[PDB]
Structures are given as C-alpha cells and as structure tokens.
C-alpha cells in the first residue's frame, strides 16, 4: 500500500515529524481511546493553527521512537493519501481498487491504525468526484469490528456536521479537544523550530524578538490563532531580511524586526506597538481639547477614570469602566466618545436605546435563546464584544430602553459576559461602557406659572438620580456632565462648516468669503442652547450653499470665480455674483 | 445482494454477535410475529442504546444455535446495508434495479428474513427524488403478499414522526416495545459480556467494580441508557 | 407486459388470492362505470384496510369462478408492477418505449382491463427532466377515448394531496366510495376467509371466537379499520394456537384465546380477573391501609372505582373513575394516590398544574395548531395517554391551574377522550383520574367575631363548589374530604417513618434499634396538628439521623455494627450506644 | 350523467328488464354520484321517518319539544321542501346540566343511521386554533394537514355534526360559522369547499346556567328564567343568532321523568350482568325508593348513576368478583320497611 498511504512512522523516521509540544494529554487520549476494544476510534478536534496536525503525528512520533505503551504495541500509523490513491487514474474503477486494497492490506496488518487527515473532506466524494463516494461506507464496518484503528481529523465546527451526520461514525469515534498553546508555549514551539528558521533564514533571532512574535501578534492578528501566526511573523522577518540586503550583515532579528513585520499585515505596532502606556492617554485630554472645545472637565474626568483602569485597579471579571454623559444634545457628547476611540486605537460599537424600547427588540439585541436575530446573531451585542473585545461601546439615549436592556447591562457590569443564543460568550472586560442621556437638561427648559417667572434651573444630577435607579448608578465609574457650548466654540463650529464649503468650492474653483459677522450670525441663529450646535448642519446648509448651487446650475456662473457674502444690517445674506 | 447484506448467521458462526442475556419476552413476541400469515414484519421500538439493535442480532445467532422453534430452522437472518444499496446511482433505472435485484435474490428462499435498521430512513421515499416511486412504494406491494418477511427497527420518536403517516407502512409492521434494563439487569448484561473485556484488555473486573460502573453510571452519567453507559 | 403486469386470473385460478365476501354494491357500480362508452375508469378511494384492493382483485376472481356477469366474462385484469417500468431505462427514450409498448399491447388485446395499486404514484411518473412528460400526462388520451380501461386505487389522504390536484387527470376517472363494513358484515368475512387461516396454522377457531374477535376489536382497538382489525386478531390468535404444538400442546382457538390476543393491546383482560388477580384485588384495600393511616374513605373510593372495572360493571365510555381529593395539608392526599399505582403495577403519570398558570399554556397539553412554531413537537397529555393506556393519571394542585384549563377535562372526563393537533385520539378509558386539592381549607380556620362564636364548618364545601363550575363538578366520581390527623395516626406515622431509617442504614451495614419511650417522646414532640404529618420526618431528621451521619461518616459507627437509642427519663433526652 | 344513466340502464336487461331511460333514472344516478339520498323517500324510509319522532322518546324523556323540531327538519329536507343552500337545520340546545342536551343529539344520528361528526369546542379557546378547522395558509409548516372540520366534512356529507359546548371556544371561531349556516359552504387551505347542504347542525351551550340558578335578595324569589335574554344575547352577535332555526330551551327534570330514568339505568345494569351469565331483578318498591333517595332538582339526571352504582353495582361486584355471585346464581332486590334497606341473593 505504497502508494495508498503514508506511513508516519517512516516520516517520523525520516526527520518529517517534529516531537510534540504541549499536548500531551491529548496524545495520551488518544492512546485511551485506541486501547478501547469498541468505539475505539479517537478523533482529533481543532482548528487548522492549533495542532489538530501536530497531534496526530505527535503519535506517530512516538511511535517510531519507541514512546509507546506495550498495549500498541508494534504498530505502524499510516496516512489516508487520498492524493495518491486517486493519482495517475482519477477513475472509481482503480480508485475503488486501490482503496478496497488499502482497507485490506490495514485490516490484515498487527496493529494497523488509519490515519485520516482532514476527514471531515472526504465526506463528499472520497478525494474527489469519480473516486471513493463510498469510502465512508467501507469504513463503518470495519470500524465496527475493529479491524483497522482509525484517528479522525476534523475541525470544532465539521465535527458537529461531519460525525454527527451518521451515527455508524459517531459512535465509533472519541472526541478529543485540541485548543491552542499560550505564550510562553507558542514561544517554545518558535524556539523549538528557531535552528531551523534561523537555518532557513541565514539568520538569528533574539530571545526578545521571538517573544515579541508572540506577545505582540496577540494584539494584531486578531483573528487566526497565535501559534502559526507569531510564526508566520518569525518566517516574515527572516525571510523578509533574507531578501532584502539584510541578514548578509544585519542577522540578527530583534523586536524592532518583529514589530515591523506585523505591521506590515497590521500596520499598527510599527508606529504604535507602544507609545506612551500612560502618556497617550493624558495627552488626550490634550488632543480632545484640538476638536472638542468645551466640556473640558468631562474629558479630563474620563482620562482619569481610564488611567485608573489601567493601573490595574478593578477585578479580573470586570469592565474597563462604565460612565453615564449627561447633557444638552449638540454639545459634543458623541464627538468626545469618536475622538476617543480613534485616539486609543480603538473600534466603536454603537446601539439606539430608542430602537430596544419595545420587549421584543430586547431579546434580539440580548441574543437570548427565543426572539434573537438570524440564527446566530445573536445577539446583537454579544456579536458586536466578540468581533471586537477592546472597543468602546456606546448606547445612545438610554432612558428610552425598555427595562430588561436596563437589566442585561447591570448583569454585563457585574460580571464581564453576555451569553448568546448559541451558548457563546462576549468578553466585556476590555470594553469601555459610555451611556447617554438628554433628560438631564430637559427640565430647564420649562416655562413656570404666575405673574413673575422664576429660574427653572435644576440640578441635572438629581434629575438622572430620580430617572436612573441607584443600582445602576453604584455601579458607574462615573457621571459626567458636558455643558452648553460658548460663542467661541460655535465660532469654531461654524468656521468647520464654512471650511469645508469652501473645499468644495474650491475643488470647482469658486472662492468663497463670509464676512465675520455673516460668521458669527450663522453660529448664533443656529445654535440652539437646548440643540447645541446639532442644527449648524442646516443653518450651512441651506444659507451658504442654495444661493451658489443655483448661479452654477443656472450658468450665470463658471467654475472660476469669487463670491463674497457679507452680513448686512438686516440680517441677509449679502451674495454678489462672483 | 452481494454487497448490500451480511449473512448474520455466518456472522454468529465465525463470532460475530454476542448472546442476549435476559431477553426473553422480547423473543417470544418476535417469533410470534414472524410466524403470521400476513404483516408478519416485527418492528422493534426503543430508545438509542438499550438492546434495541442487539435483539434483531440475538435472533440471528439462536437461529444458529437451535435455539428457536423448528419454525425457524433454516432461516437466515441478513442486515442491509442502505448506504451501500444507494450509494453509486444517479441514472433514472439506477434505484429501481438495483432494489429490485436485491429483492429478487430473497424473493426466491423461503426461510430468508431481512433486517433493516434506520427503517423510517425508507420512509418518506427514501432516496426517491422528483415525485413518489419511493422505495415505499416498491414495497408496499410485497409486505401485503408475505413475500418477505422484515424486522425493522427504530426509535420512539422517529417511528412517530413517520411511521403512523403513511399509515399504509404502519399497518404491515407489528410494533414491539424494546425497554431499558434495570440496574440488576445491567450488572447481568456486564457479567454476561464480560470475559470479552477482560479478553481485550487483560484485564480483570471484581465483582464490586462492576456493581459500581451500573450504579455510578446511574448517579451520575445522565445522557443514555444503562446497555450503553454502564458497559462503557 | 410480459416482463411487467400480472395477470391475475392467473392467481384466481390457483388460488393464489383470499376470495371477496360481500361488496355487492361495490361491485355493482364498478361494472357500471366499466360499461360505459367514455372515461370508463373507476377509482377506488378510501380508509386504509377496507378492502380497497380486495375488491379490485375480487373481480378477478369472481370472473374466473364465473360469478359476474356475461359482459364481464372472458375479461383478463392485469395488475402493473411500476417499479419494473422504471428499473434499467437509462437513456432517453428506453422509459417512453417501454411504457408505449405497454399500452399498444392493451389496446390491441381489446377486452383486458389494467389496474393498478398506488395510482396516485403514477401522477409524476418517471420525468426525464425540464420536460414534463411523465407516465401520467402520456398516459391520457387513451383514457379519455375509451380505448383503454384502467382501475385505479388509493386512500383518502393521498387522493386528496396527491392527484386531488391535477384536474386533467382526476376528471378521467369515476371516483368510488369504499366504506368500512359493519359488525355482522365483518363477521361474514372472516368465516368465508377462516379455512385459509384454519390451514395456514394447523387450527380451528369456534364459533365463538369468530364472534368475539370482531366485537372486542370494535371495543378495544382503536386506530384501524375494524376488517383488517378483525382479521388480525383472528391471524394472530391462529399463530399463538400454532406455537402451542411444539411442545405438543395441540389446540383449537376459543373465546378464552381471543380475550388474551386483544388484551394483549387494551391491557386488561376480562379473564384473569377470575384467576389469581381476584386476590391481588381483594387485598388492595389493606395493602394501602398499611401506607396510609386514617383516611379510610380515601381508599374505599379508590378501591372500588376499581373493582366495578374490573367485575365488568364499566361505565362503557368514561374512565375507571374520576375523583377529587381536597383537605388540610401533609395527610396524604398525594400519597395515597402514588401508593395506589405501586399497589397495582401500574404507571403513574404525573402532571403539575402550577405549571399551567395562564390560560394560553393549555396549548403546552394537547399542541400549537397548524402553521405555528412547535407545531410538529407534541402534546404532552395526550402522549403520555397514548403511550400508556392503563395507569393512574394524577394531576396535583388542581386550583393552580388556570381555571380555563378546567375545561379540558370537563371533555375528557365525560367522554374518555381528547383530540391533539393531529386529529388522534386519547382514550382515557382504563385511566384512574386523580386531582389534588387544598381549597377549601382556609376558610375553615377562620376565626369568628362576636359575643357568641358561631360555627362553620360548612365552608369547605361552599369554597370548594364557586370554584368548580357545575358541570365539572357534578362529572366527578365523588369529592374526598379528608381530614386532620390525630395523635394514635402520628404514632402510626413515627413507626412508618422509623422503619424507612432502619432500612436506609441497614443499606450501610448497620441496624438500628430504639424503644419504646424514644418513640413516644419523639411523637409527642414532633406533632402539630396544623401541619398534619409531614413534619415528623423533621423530627427525626433531627434526633436520629444528624447523630447518625457523624459516626457512620467518620468511622465510629461502621458497616458491621449496631446502634441502639433509648429515652433518658431524668434529662427528657435520648440516648445513644454502640 | 346521461352515459352512466345509459350504461346503467343497458345493464337492466341482466333481468331483462329493457326499457328508455327516464327522469327517474338520471335522478337516481345524481343522487348516487353525489351521494345524495332522494328517491327511497318513497320506500320504507317513509315509516323510518315517520316513526322517528317516537323512537326518540324511549331514550330521551321530557324535552318533548327538541325531539320534534329536530324532528321536523328532518322531514321537510327528505320531503323536498327544504332550503336552497342551507344546512338541514340549524340549532343551538340550551338549559340546565344533565338534561339531555348532548345525549338526544347522539341518539339521533343513531337514529337515522348516518355518521355523527363530533367536536369539541373546549378545544379551541385560543384564537389560532381555527387553523385546525381551516387548516395552514400556504407556505407554512401544517400546510400538507388540510382542516379538520372541512376534512370531515367532505368525507362524510350526510351526518350529524355536533359541537359540543360551543360557548367555550374563542368568540372568534365562531365567525366561521356564519358562512357555514347561512351559505352552506365552508372554504378550506387548498380552495376546496365543504358542502354542508345535507347535515344537521347541532350546538349546544351551557349559557345562562349559573346565572338562573341563583337566588336573590328581597321579600319576593323572582323568577329568574330569562337567561336567554341576557347571556344567550351577550354571547352570540346579532348576525349569529340571526341566522339560527331555533334555541331551544330544555327543562329540569322532574319526578316523573326521573322514575323512567331509573328504569333506564336499570335495564343498562341488567345488560352488562347478562353478559356475565347472571340476572338481576328488582322490586318495585326498591325502585322507588332509589329514585327519591337519588333525586336532585339541581343537577337533572346526572346524579341517578351514582345512586345506582352505590346501592346495585358496587354490592354486586363483590358477588362477581369473590365468588358469591357467579355462575349458577341470580340476584334479586327488594326493599325491607324498617331501615328501607336492600336485599340480594342467589
Ligand atoms: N369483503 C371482503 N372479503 C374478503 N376479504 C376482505 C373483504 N374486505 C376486506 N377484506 C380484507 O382486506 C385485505 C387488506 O385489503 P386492503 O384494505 O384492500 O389493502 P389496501 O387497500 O392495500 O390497504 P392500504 O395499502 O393500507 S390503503 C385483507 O387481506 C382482506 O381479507
Ligand atoms: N395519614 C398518613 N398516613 C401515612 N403516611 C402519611 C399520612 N399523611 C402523610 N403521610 C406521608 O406522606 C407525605 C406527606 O403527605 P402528602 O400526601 O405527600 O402531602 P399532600 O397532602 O399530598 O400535599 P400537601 O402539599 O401536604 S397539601 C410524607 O411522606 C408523610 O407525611
Ligand atoms: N331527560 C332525560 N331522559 C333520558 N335520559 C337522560 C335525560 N337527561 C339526561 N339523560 C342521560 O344522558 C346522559 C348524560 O348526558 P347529557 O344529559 O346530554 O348531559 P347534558 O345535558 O348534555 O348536559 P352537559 O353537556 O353534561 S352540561 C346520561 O346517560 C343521562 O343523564
Ligand atoms: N465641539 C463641538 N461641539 C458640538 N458640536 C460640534 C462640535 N464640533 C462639531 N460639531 C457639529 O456636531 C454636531 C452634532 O453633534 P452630535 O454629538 O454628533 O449629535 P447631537 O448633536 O444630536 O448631540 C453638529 O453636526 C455640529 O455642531
Ligand atoms: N440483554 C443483552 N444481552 C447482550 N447484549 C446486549 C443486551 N442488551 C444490549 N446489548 C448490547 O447493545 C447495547 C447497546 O444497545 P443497542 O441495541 O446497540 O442500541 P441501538 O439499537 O440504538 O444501536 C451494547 O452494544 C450491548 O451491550
């Protein structure tokens, strides 16, 4: 059976085969499991990345190695070649015969055990269409009786779909779990290999660069586990320095190396690996201030909290913080919360409390077992905490959510999950929780009774004391108030609209002035002390852009041009032609 | 025929199958199906893992045995293999003739028996695509006439959700209850089966490890029946 | 047809088929359909096990035993085998040939009739493809024309589902009713069909059990038609009769066999009732008595409800009895009833009513209707009556309940029966109907206000009667009051309670022995009148078994000796050795 | 229908009966395509029907007036002076418990011969329950089920259909009901129509009861009969009730009645004893001793069987079943003065 399978004992023999690293009771579960006189058959549960592979000829490892009970005792584990079995026919005629052949020459040897790599692919049609549709239902009764030990591979999610799929094999084939290896783990499966890399590569790794391959793709990869991807990033530095006119002087590889190559795939650590783990953060109080101009003791408030946070005071479970903004609309509360997020390196999550009002929208965004979204949603939010476990979260308007969202989120605050409909679980403990709220200043907006109005101005914390329950706010980091805005910050505000007119304006080629006082007049008319500065989007709008986009459109205008619009006395926009 | 049945006899002859330990009544009713003039199709109707597979097969090897009626003497009890039977086809005439020359390979005994198991797999046409002629309606026909006679074999809530349907099938197959046993009845079951375990694995049970494996697999295993958890 | 049809005066002539009994009408209409000049194709619909196909190849047999008309003389009824039509015509045109040459060797014999069974099947008759021409639309004009005749067969559901929808072809067959038999029908069958049964099984039956097994099956087997229910009693007891001779035991079938075989299916035989079973019952009475103490109205009821059933004394179609048990707490309302399923050996079906708290959550009993989720799970009373028909059906806190659910069983308990959502049916009829109540209790502890404390008592019932409707409660059995328990029952109570101990330990290798002053210490200071026996168990958890646990945990006490305890008189203590 | 007439009537000469084919014969042949009875009106079924009215009052006593307006509507459909397109009748029975209501209904459908299509409206006290008369729209999971009454309906066109306490469903499912008594038809998830033109419609309620059972506060008891002008009204919408033959009110049940409900239940006993092999007679005086012991206004004839399983059954089936009273003995009952006690024998 030459060329039916591979024998991994030989490939073992023949370098091929690197000696396990961690594992190893998964090695020995299988052996558990191939001992067993039925249903004696271990499968191997992962992942491409996190040794479902490795296992599998860990086993065959030992066994060439002698590593072995006496209860094995001779054997010779061999590896289904679906390649070569469908090779130089592709036909079911010699397929079939090769296959049959291959079953019998195992059946008949001491100790025979069949390795399947990637078994959850022969599920279709054996290596391919024209082959072995049927190599599965050959299988089954040999598995029965015993005939031929078989070590499955399958993946977390095939399992599930490919045994489950007929009790002949689910019944017959042990379930192993294979997860992936740590840091200091995936550091030594790099040392492990780093004669070889550094061999391959005509370079040196230092001991610093190989844990930055690990400690730093943890960070960055994000999405394909750690052990081949730290590897990947050792295989990429040094390939990238054999290359380049490097390593031929230069071999050496240090973290700095590392931290170049994961950017290349991240393009983060290269300028932002670590900058300033106390520093970037009180500078922003700094740099909110460049687009956030007010509510400066809001954002210093905030800078503090997360400082704290990260001076590791809180518990394991928890969440980096929680805070409630409270406040007029129009006044920055959403634009601190974006400033932030893209200054921590961060993504933003974001959620209307209004559209989770209602009981039934409330299951949905919970992903709770009835009434979620899709299959598998879930879970809006929980969806949302495992896609991207550092974020800050937002919801918006929270006094419009229906109780139970109210009653998730107290859950989430206490203890740093979500479960989903799927039995899956958000991880909390790195988000940033920031609520909001325009009921604060609502009340002041009342007009009283009698002969001489008095001044409604109340406490906008004891508003939020009487809307929001003292649970809720025992477990806030903080209450945060961001005030009305200034007549220099609408200044400011305006002056941002008019700018990026005149960029369109530009780009056709009309130069646009507005008198300081047209400048002012429009911060003043749109800027609405209960709306913020939320209407300047109209008061720009309409009065700077209708009156231009007409000459244009009409052909009184030409791309060129200069148009001045001077406030007059009477308040109207005083346009020329241009 | 050839590679869709397995001679059950030979099977118990070579090894095959175990003896059945304390399964008596179940065997009584068996035989007092097979042995009617019509719709004589036993139907064995269990929950997964409790002998409900082991007594189709335990007919088979007292078959052998002399264990059974004169009735019986003769017969021969082979399972099918649905995978095999409809696997490999894709041509329009490839099911019908295919079925048909499996059937006529027992049509022409007297004393043959066929065993299906997953038989409400069969229900609903089987592999029957584009509109009836499911293997049903292949045998239908037949099952009326006593031309063959089936043990079929199923669970609770699958023989519910198909069987009792197409109530034509459900009327020419005889239901029998298949329970799980008792924890004595376990311990019997393990002793019975045990010089197997002990011959695989050189090993040797006391008789306190095997009282123990039935009442902890009680106390605390809690997803199957004792047959299939207590020998594990 | 050579390698396709039957004919079938073939079997006629050999007797290969049973003979048609009766069906006068039947085949009179058919006849009539046949003689006509156009569509000449009758169709026969029905229930399934009617004698649909009896009739169909009855014919052929009465015109071979020259039993039809002249017009029918000479006649050929041919009977196509499909799945031979199909089998082997691979390419385009072998499938079209067959079923061509098929019909053109009909229509060229001239006086042959073709049937077939399952014609439904035909309706999407083998389709090549995108094409539609399929056995069926091919196969019309011929039927249209008169060319050809044919005799078509199938149920009710499947006419209705299955062709019951193409119209060109429905239109070119005369539709037929075959209804189920009667009693005195059915009986004439199966005398005409008994010497085939008599030869097959080497038997003889009497006239008597002819007779039985018609009327018990009509009785007792509820989901087929009472022909093919007949019949199979009559196959079944001939069967037991020929599996009597191997042993020698040689036999005619009686009225005696028959109750046995139908029993085997109702499970209440109306003979062992004369046998050892006579004792069974007349000892239940005591056998309870020793479980339950005091209450002895309780236990009549329940004893005699059964007795009648048994003796035959019935209530044709209600259940063996309907009672409910209302009265204080901790006396046994709920034990009695699970002591009288052990008592019997029979299954005990419990059902919470606290569970059905709103009225919507009947549909949590009896299943969701047509087109809504969970249709396809269930009704979870009527299964559990399905799958057992003999057992002791208690439903517990019957006031818990929503009162709408009541009405569920103002049905069940008048009738015997309950339809689910598939239109099956629960037959209540060998079920004891228990439910528990504690209604009335409170009102009767209610103290009076005045200078001459009036009596109660009466209360209980008026609380009881403006809960339950009348026409519920006038549908019982009988109501069971039950009352307080005394202290000679308490001392009943502690013996009970103690003897369960011993048993427990004796488990642990240690027996127990107490006098007679520690149980008559315990039982004075265990009783309370206001929460019946229950709280004895109490008492003793805490005299005799907390003492226990900690010298047979750790080893003072073990497997192997004996504990004694005994009243100190002096310190109103108990003792304890070793 | 005129080449079945035709090929029937080529098949009379088997008798030799030759002759043309005339009205007669395609009326036949209709009403056998359709299965619809018509010209046997002629035959025996004329004292079928004529005694039908009487046959009914052996086994349901009092309540004269049901028996007969069903009664009648059985006749003017069978005499041909029926609707157009209307059901056979349409009624809905009302009055105090135990009284016959559901019983006369059962008896007849015996009566005539013909199906008695049962339902219990208890069942469908949600409002989506309806699916199951109706059955699924298309698309959805219960699709290939069809309904259940218009099942039932197709497969049997002549019956009795009953709806028992029908003033427990849904006050919506009863809007189905309307097209049913007024059009005859009943459209089902697949476009086919029930036919309801050959069946009695029967329903009965429970409406009123508790109400004018109670008694109320003042010098005068006042007479509390007019239920049927509270929750009869209340119940059923005006288009509803509209659309009825008749509600017929049943009585309670008085003395006289209940001594030939005794005698009823009496002869039922004597049945199922035969069936053992034994006979039991009774005295006169024990029977009316039965009766009064027995009798309650409240709850009409409900009551007399548990009277009569505790004074004859239970004592007899100690006798069957300890071996006092089995075969070789009969049993005779009579009642003693002095404790007005009952004998038994052998
Ligand atoms: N009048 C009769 N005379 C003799 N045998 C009868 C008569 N009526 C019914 N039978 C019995 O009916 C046969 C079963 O017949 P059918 O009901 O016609 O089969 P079926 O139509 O194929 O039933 P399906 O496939 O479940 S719908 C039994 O073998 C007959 O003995
Ligand atoms: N009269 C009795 N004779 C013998 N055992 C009894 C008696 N009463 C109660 N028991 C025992 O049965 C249990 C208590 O009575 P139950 O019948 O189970 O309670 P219940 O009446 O059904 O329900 P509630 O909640 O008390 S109303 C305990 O195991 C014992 O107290
Ligand atoms: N007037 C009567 N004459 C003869 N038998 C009667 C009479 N009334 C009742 N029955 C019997 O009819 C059976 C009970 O059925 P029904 O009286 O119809 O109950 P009901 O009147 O329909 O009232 P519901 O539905 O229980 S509230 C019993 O066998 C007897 O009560
Ligand atoms: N420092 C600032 N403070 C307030 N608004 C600003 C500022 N800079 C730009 N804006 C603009 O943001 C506003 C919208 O603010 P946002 O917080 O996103 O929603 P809302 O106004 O409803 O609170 C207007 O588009 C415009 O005033
Ligand atoms: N009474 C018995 N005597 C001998 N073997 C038995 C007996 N009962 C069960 N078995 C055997 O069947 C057990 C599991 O039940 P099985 O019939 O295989 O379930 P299933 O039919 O669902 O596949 C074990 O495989 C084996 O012990």
Redesign the interface.
């Known amino acids: 059976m030459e060329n039916f399978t591979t024998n991994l004992n030989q490939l073992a023999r023949v370098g091929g085969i690197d000696p396990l690293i961690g594992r190893e009771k998964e090695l020995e579960r299988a052996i558990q499991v191939l ?1 067993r ?1 039925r ?1 004696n058959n271990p499968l191997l549960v992962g992942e491409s990345g996190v040794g479902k592979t490795a296992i599998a000829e860990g086993l065959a490892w030992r066994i060439v190695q002698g590593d072995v009970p006496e209860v094995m005792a001779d054997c010779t584990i061999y590896s289904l070649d679906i390649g070569s079995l469908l090779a130089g026919t592709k036909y079911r005629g010699d397929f079939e015969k090769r296959f049959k052949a291959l079953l019998k020459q195992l059946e008949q040897d001491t100790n025979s055990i069949l390795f399947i790599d990637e078994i959850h692919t022969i599920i279709g049609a054996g290596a391919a269409s024209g082959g072995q ?2 190599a ?2 050959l299988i ?2 040999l598995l029965s009786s015993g005939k031929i030990r078989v070590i499955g591979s399958t993946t977390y999610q095939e399992f599930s779909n490919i045994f489950e799929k007929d009790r ?1 094999l689910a019944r017959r084939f042990q379930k192993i779990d294979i997860t992936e290896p740590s840091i200091e783990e995936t550091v030594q499966i790099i040392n492990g290999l780093k004669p070889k890399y550094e061999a391959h590569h005509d370079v040196r790794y230092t001991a610093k660069a190989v844990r930055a391959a690990v400690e730093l793709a943890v960070k960055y990869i994000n999405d394909r586990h750690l052990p081949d991807k730290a590897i990947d990033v050792i295989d990429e530095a040094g390939a990238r320095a054999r290359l380049m006119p490097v390593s031929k002087r230069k071999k050496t590889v240090n973290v700095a190396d590392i931290e170049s190559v994961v950017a290349r795939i991240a393009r983060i650590p290269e300028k932002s690996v670590s900058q300033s783990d106390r520093d970037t953060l009180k500078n922003l109080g700094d740099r909110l201030k460049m687009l956030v101009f007010g509510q400066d003791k809001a954002i210093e408030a905030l800078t503090e909290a997360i400082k704290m946070a990260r001076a590791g005071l809180g518990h394991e479970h928890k969440p980096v913080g929680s805070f409630l903004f409270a406040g007029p609309t129009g006044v920055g509360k959403t634009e601190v919360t974006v400033q932030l997020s893209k200054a921590l390196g961060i993504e933003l999550l974001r959620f209307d409390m209004s559209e989770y009002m209602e009981r039934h929208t409330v299951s949905r965004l919970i992903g709770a077992p009835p009434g979620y979204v899709g299959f598998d949603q879930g879970g809006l939010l929980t969806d949302a905490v495992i896609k991207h476990p550092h974020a800050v979260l937002l919801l918006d308007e929270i006094e419009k959510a229906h109780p139970d969202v109210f009653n998730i989120l107290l859950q989430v605050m206490d203890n740093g999950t979500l479960t989903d409909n799927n039995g899956r679980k958000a991880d909390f403990r790195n988000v940033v929780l920031v609520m909001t709220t325009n009921a604060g200043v609502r009340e002041t907006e009342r007009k009283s009774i009698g002969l001489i109005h008095q001044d409604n101005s109340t406490d906008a914390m004891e508003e939020i004391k009487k809307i929001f329950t003292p649970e809720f706010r025992n477990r806030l980091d903080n209450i945060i108030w961001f005030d009305h805005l200034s007549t220099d910050v609408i200044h400011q505000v305006v002056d941002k609209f008019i700018v990026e007119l005149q960029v369109q304006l530009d780009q056709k080629g009309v130069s646009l002035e507005v008198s300081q006082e047209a400048r002012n007049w429009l911060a003043e008319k749109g800027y609405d002390r209960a709306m913020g500065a939320r209407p300047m989007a109209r008061v720009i709008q309409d009065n700077l852009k209708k009156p231009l986009a007409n000459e244009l459109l009409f052909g009184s205008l030409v791309d060129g041009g200069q148009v001045t619009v001077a406030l007059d006395k009477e308040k109207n926009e005083l346009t020329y032609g241009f």
């Open positions: 001992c006189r249903k549709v049927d599965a239902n089954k009764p002949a």
